[PDB]
Amino acid sequence: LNGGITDMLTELANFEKNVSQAIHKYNAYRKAASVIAKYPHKIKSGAEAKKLPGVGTKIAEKIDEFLATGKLRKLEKIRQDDTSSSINFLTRVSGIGPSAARKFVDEGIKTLEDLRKNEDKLNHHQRIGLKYFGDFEKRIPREEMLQMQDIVLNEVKKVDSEYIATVCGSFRRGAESSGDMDVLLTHPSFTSESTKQPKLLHQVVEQLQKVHFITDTLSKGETKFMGVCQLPSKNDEKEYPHRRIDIRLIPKDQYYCGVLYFTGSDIFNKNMRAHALEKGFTINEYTIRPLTGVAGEPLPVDSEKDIFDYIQWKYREPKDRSE
DNA sequence: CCGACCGCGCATCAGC
DNA sequence: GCTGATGCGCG
DNA sequence: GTCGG
Ligand SMILES: [Mg+2]
Ligand SMILES: [Mg+2]
Ligand code: NA
């Protein structure tokens, strides 16, 4: 109902993040954008909006101007500025953040041609992000997420029938399209107690590469792989776009905290974690522990709901965590 | 007013 | 090489 | 930029 407002604020949040490098302003706009996005009425005024938490005086003024004119002067100016525009653009390349973006514009590299021209000034992650720049902009229809899932789950079962591979992220929240693919991996040999087998993640990355599902690698350690994959296409069929894929190997006994984390959303995780802090707990992808203001021992978790119970939240299905 | 704003993996660099 | 700080990315 | 104390 409030698409224009939420777009406005998301553009503002991006600006603060990419250009101003004021992350708290970025988070302020993102929170507001999210609370408004779920408000079940068409906002008639900035006062009506200010009743929501996250919407304050400043954002209320914004919403009133946008409502009046259909525009924000602040944004129309930001759009008109070259340094800001270029910086904001460059940041869309995976691996180029606000700092790299600003250094690049400093050197006179500010367009997509410039980047291609200057690949030797790019690190690996950056080169692959430029390579698949167009692809990584596309969303993934759920139907393709379903094929991708089959592949990953079937291949992993071939490396060792004891791996458990769970697709998380937006896919798990039931989205009709996903920004990418997110795979939580567990193997019984790897727990909080011990790592009984080396290269648990490697063998999996290896296998998925062997069958040409994984095509590139952005980053890779003992527990986190961040890379690129592609569905196989039929005879004469145009190739599918290349897609980002993240794989996270998590202690088997810490699954429920792991799957909570990877299911998100990102904003939901930030809100859940902040609420946990007020309630007197700290939540990460491994454990929830009680808080001198210093973290205690891991409390026993047997489901995602047990985590919710701790911080006195009613349970929310994954499909309701898309904040 | 003002402090506080999650939590963490991997790549890179400085500095030793 | 190592440690630690910083950039970037994940949700 | 917002908000809680
Ligand atoms: Mg995702
Ligand atoms: Mg994401
Ligand atoms: Na991802």
Side-chain angles (χ1 to χ4, degrees), chain A residues 102-162:
Chain A
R102 186 169 283 273
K103 174 175 162 290
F104 282 145
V105 176
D106 269 14
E107 311 175 294
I109 303 177
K110 53 186 54 152
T111 72
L112 188 57
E113 265 186 8
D114 304 341
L115 283 175
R116 297 182 164 137
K117 171 159 209 174
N118 293 276
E119 286 178 35
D120 63 349
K121 291 175 82 174
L122 289 193
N123 61 32
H124 180 64
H125 186 147
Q126 290 170 338
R127 279 185 71 166
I128 311 300
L130 165 54
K131 185 187 183 161
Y132 304 110
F133 173 63
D135 274 326
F136 292 174
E137 295 279 284
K138 304 188 175 74
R139 292 191 71 78
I140 301 165
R142 188 174 186 88
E143 182 157 77
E144 292 177 31
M145 292 291 283
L146 289 174
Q147 313 181 32
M148 298 171 62
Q149 181 176 232
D150 277 343
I151 303 196
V152 166
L153 269 61
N154 275 285
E155 292 296 321
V156 164
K157 168 193 303 178
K158 296 174 189 177
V159 176
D160 194 330
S161 65
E162 286 198 318

Side-chain angles (χ1 to χ4, degrees), chain A residues 169 179-183 226 244-247 262:
Chain A
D180 70 345
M181 188 179 203
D182 299 313
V183 182
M226 178 191 323
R244 274 271 296 103
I245 181 155
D246 290 330
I247 303 180
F262 228 12

Side-chain angles (χ1 to χ4, degrees), chain A residues 61-115:
Chain A
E61 290 174 14
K62 304 289 202 288
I63 291 177
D64 278 343
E65 175 178 357
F66 179 79
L67 285 175
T69 57
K71 310 184 303 72
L72 207 66
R73 268 162 316 130
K74 184 173 176 66
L75 281 180
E76 291 260 291
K77 175 165 186 177
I78 290 170
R79 291 189 183 95
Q80 215 165 313
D81 186 274
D82 300 309
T83 294
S84 296
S85 297
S86 294
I87 288 181
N88 258 316
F89 171 72
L90 294 174
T91 60
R92 296 156 61 179
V93 185
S94 186
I96 300 195
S99 186
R102 186 169 283 273
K103 174 175 162 290
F104 282 145
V105 176
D106 269 14
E107 311 175 294
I109 303 177
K110 53 186 54 152
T111 72
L112 188 57
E113 265 186 8
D114 304 341
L115 283 175

Side-chain angles (χ1 to χ4, degrees), chain A residues 251-296 298-310:
Chain A
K252 183 162 179 49
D253 60 304
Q254 292 177 338
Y255 172 80
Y256 299 106
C257 282
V259 75
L260 173 63
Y261 157 69
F262 228 12
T263 295
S265 70
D266 57 348
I267 297 180
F268 168 91
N269 286 359
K270 281 186 78 281
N271 288 335
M272 193 173 180
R273 297 190 177 186
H275 183 72
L277 287 190
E278 311 164 25
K279 285 298 186 176
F281 303 79
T282 181
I283 302 186
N284 67 23
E285 61 259 66
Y286 305 121
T287 63
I288 181 177
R289 313 152 170 258
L291 292 174
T292 47
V294 161
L299 311 162
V301 176
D302 285 289
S303 57
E304 291 168 82
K305 180 187 215 302
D306 288 2
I307 311 175
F308 281 84
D309 286 345
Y310 278 115

